[PDB]
Structure formats: C-alpha cells, structure tokens
C-alpha cells in the first residue's frame, strides 16, 4: 500500500465524516435541553429517549452495515448513508410532533450515520499498513476537535433563530459529507466466520464488558460538578480540558501504536481500562477543583488510548479481508452496554441522592474488562493449545 500520497485526502474525508456525525449528535441534545426549559410539554422521558435512540442506532446497526459494505463497496455504502442522513435531517424541520420526530430523527438520521460510519473506519486500512496507527490517530484527533467546535459555533452564530432552521443549517454538513464520500477509491450472509478466533472473541467480550461502565464519567461529571462545590463559576473549563487532552492523547496514542509489534498493542487498552477504573473510583474522593482538573487530563488520555487503537488491533487480529466484519460486530456488541450505563447511573442518583455510589459502581466494569483482556491468548499459545488438545 502507498502509505501516503492519495491516502491523505481519504484521511481528510474520514475526519470530516466522524466530526460532523458526532458534532451533530452532541449539538442536537444540547439544543433540546434549552427548548425543554423554555417551553412546557404540549414527553418528559421520550424527549431524551429519542436522542438516546439516535445515538445508539449508530452502533446497533453496524452488523447490517458490514454486509452492505462487503457486498457493494465503501464508496457506495458511505454515499447512500450520507444521502439518507441528509434526507432525515432535512425532513426533521417539519412541524413539531413527537411521533414524527421519533421516526425522522431516531431512525432515518441514526441509520444514515450508521451506514456512513463503518466505511470510514474500514477505508483507511486500504492505504496505510505501516502507518495505520498514525492515520487513525490523525482522524480521531480531527474528529475530536471538529465535534468540540459545533456547540461553540452555533450557540453564538445562531442569532436566536428558531429550532426549525437549525436542522436546515445542519443538513449542509451531511450534504458536504455526501460529496466528499466520492473520494473513497478501492484497492482490494450471517456467516459468523470471525467468531472462530478465541483471541477475537475474548477481546470483543472484554471490550463489551468494559463499555457498560466506561462512559459514565464522560456523561455525568459535568453535572456532578454542578451539584458538588457548585460555587466554581469556571465549570466550563473542564470540558475544554477534556477535549484538548483527548485530542492530544489520541494523536500520541496513534503515533505510539506503530512501534508496538503484534498483539502486544492490547496492553495499552489494558492499562487504559485500569487507569480509568481507578480514576473513576477516586473521583468522589477529590475535594479540590485544582485536583479535579488533574483528573480531567487522565480521563482525556484514557479516552484516546481506548478509542484510537481499536481498528488497528482488529486489522492485526483478523487480517485486512475480515476487518470490516470484525469492526461491525465489535460495534454491534458494544451498542447495548454503553446505552444501558448512564441510565443506571441516573437511577442510582435518584435512589441515593448523590453520585458517589454511581461512580463507585461505574469504576468496576472497566476493571473487569481489563482483567478479561489480560488473558487474551498469544499467537504461539493458540497453536500450543491446539497441539496439546489434538
């Protein structure tokens, strides 16, 4: 593979795809909260369940997207997904109605993002083999910055325009992504062939187990801060710190992953899970804002060291031909626990009156996942076990 040349425009296209998807998903949720306060219901739970469904569909539909990829091609799959997402976002502008919002936003836009996402991960492997980690790190850092830029943009440049035109404005990003998707060019049912490998099966199970409690801090820290030592007026600093540290850590992790040969890359994820679990369990104990600022940096570092490295490990495990199915099923398995977590944290908060127990319980699943990942068989160990069994 070239490991460069034309691969950089593809890197730019993938960065645009991820950034636009996650920025829109984060921005719509923020917009809904303001309108909820401004206007009374005319619903309470469905208002957040619609956003939850839209976010979760991306991961839930990945296994179906993988077969469409393998059959048609990354370019066609991404173009179709972008077109469907554009149609959904444009149609969301219709008169307010919970029933119509459910369909138009959760299903159409969610499935469009699902179809547009996985090909963005699969495509990079066709151009970068010796520098795939660096490519993924660049893509992830760009995605982080782009996603962080969305609310900071609209909250000022919206000019207090009604919610109706925000969807029209946001649809342009999907249109431009549809145009950019043509840059993808090729260079190389329900069979479940991938699950044969013990290493892949254990790795996917461990990641799924960790995902249950992985995302609780990133969702509830900004609201626990407003509830304890709320006197701090600079509470928005933590979000910027997390975003910048996540971008830097994603880039650094992407660069570092290239120097670790073979399946030794899983040790980075093991260390990330251990560190995140310990930090989440500690969060309740910190009583200094200047200290919590320190915890935010480690949260950002762990976020990168976990997210950025998944695709290269999939390529290492299952070669280049089965990477699409591997990634699709990994996302499909991850889909449910990450949606289940934060709701359980909120239920615990309602029950107990504070987030201490919520963080204590969120700290465990990451440690369990780290323990599970610590025992992934080695390449020689698999053959030794086969010989001993035969």
């Amino acid at each position, epitope marked *: 593979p070239p490991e460069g040349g034309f691969g950089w425009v593809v890197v730019f296209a993938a960065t645009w795809c991820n950034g636009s998807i996650f920025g829109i998903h984060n921005s719509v949720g923020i917009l809904y909260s303001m309108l909820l306060e401004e206007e009374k219901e005319k619903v309470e739970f469905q208002a957040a369940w619609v956003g939850a469904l839209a976010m979760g569909m991306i991961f839930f539909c990945s296994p179906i997207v993988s077969i469409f990829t393998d059959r048609l091609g990354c370019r066609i799959t991404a173009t179709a997904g972008a077109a469907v997402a554009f149609i959904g976002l444009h149609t969301s502008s219709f008169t307010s109605s919970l029933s119509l919002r459910y369909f138009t936003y959760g299903i159409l836009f969610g499935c469009g993002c699902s179809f547009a996402f996985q090909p963005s991960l699969v495509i990079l492997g066709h151009y970068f083999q010796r520098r795939l980690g660096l490519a993924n790190g660049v893509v992830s850092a760009g995605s982080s910055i782009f996603s962080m830029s969305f609310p900071f943009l609209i909250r000022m440049l919206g000019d207090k325009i009604k919610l109706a035109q925000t969807f029209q404005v946001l649809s342009t990003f999907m249109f431009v992504l549809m145009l950019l998707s043509l840059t993808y060019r090729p260079l190389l049912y329900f069979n479940m062939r991938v699950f044969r490998q013990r290493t892949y099966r254990i790795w996917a199970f461990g990641i799924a187990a960790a995902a249950l409690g992985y995302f609780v801090p990133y969702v509830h820290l900004m609201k626990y801060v407003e509830e304890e030592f709320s006197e701090i007026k600079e509470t928005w600093v933590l979000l910027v710190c997390i975003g910048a540290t996540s971008g830097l850590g994603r880039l650094v992790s992407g660069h570092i992953s290239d120097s670790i040969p073979g399946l030794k890359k899983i040790y980075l994820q093991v260390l990330s899970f251990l560190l995140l679990g310990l930090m989440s369990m500690m969060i309740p104990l910190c009583r200094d804002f200047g200290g919590l600022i320190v915890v935010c940096l480690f949260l950002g570092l762990c976020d990168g060291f976990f997210i950025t490295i998944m695709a290269p490990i999939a390529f290492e495990l299952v070669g280049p031909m089965q990477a699409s199915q591997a990634i699709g099923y990994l996302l499909g398995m991850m889909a449910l626990p990450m949606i289940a977590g934060p709701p359980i944290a909120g239920l615990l908060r309602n029950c107990f009156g504070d987030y201490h127990v919520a963080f204590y319980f969120a700290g465990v699943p990451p440690i369990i996942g780290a323990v599970i990942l610590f025992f992934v068989p080695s390449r*020689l*160990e698999e*053959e*030794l076990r086969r010989r*001993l069994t035969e």
Partner: nanobody
Amino acid sequence: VQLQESGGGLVQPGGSLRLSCTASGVTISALNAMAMGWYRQAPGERRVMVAAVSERGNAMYRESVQGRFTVTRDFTNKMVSLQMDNLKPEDTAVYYCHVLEDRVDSFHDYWGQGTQVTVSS
C-alpha cells in the same frame, strides 16, 4: 534450529526422571521468539505433544501428563528442562525435543533425537 543432546532414563513406578539440554543451529535472539516443547510416542500411538513452554513463559500440559510433570526454560542458554515426578508404567514411551516458530499464516517446526523413558516394576 537443531536439537541434538537427547536423554532418557529408567525407573520404577512412583519414581522420577529429569531431562535438560541445549539446542543448536540457531541464534539465541531468534530462539527467544520461538517456543520449546516435548513430544510423545508410545508403541502403537500417534505422535502428540505433552508439554511446552510458550513465548511469554506460560507452561501448558496435556491431560495425561498434567498435574505430575513440570517444564522450565532457560532462554539465554537455549535450554528447556522437563521434570517427571511420580512416574507410572503408562508413561513408558519415546519422547522428542520440539521447537516451534511463528510465521505469516504458517509455522516452522523442528524435531530432535528420540529420548527413551521407561517405567518397569
């Protein structure tokens, strides 16, 4: 890689025996990326692996020998030691020193001179 020294012994039931040797025809650096193990073949039996040492040092054993025998490796010396404790008549069989290497969608295997181990009362 070449396995040369070989060994063996004879004991009564409930006895013990030990084996240890150094390989040849390979550099220590290359060998450190290769695993070591022992094979078995009693009269009328197929050749199967009984014990081995993995790249990370994890020792693995077959059911027939697991729980009685133990294996150790000296990475720098190119040596692997097999300790056979609580031997029994069924343990009588020929054993061969074995080495394995990892390769792209394939492996490289080596075999050593047969070693004689017998148990008789």
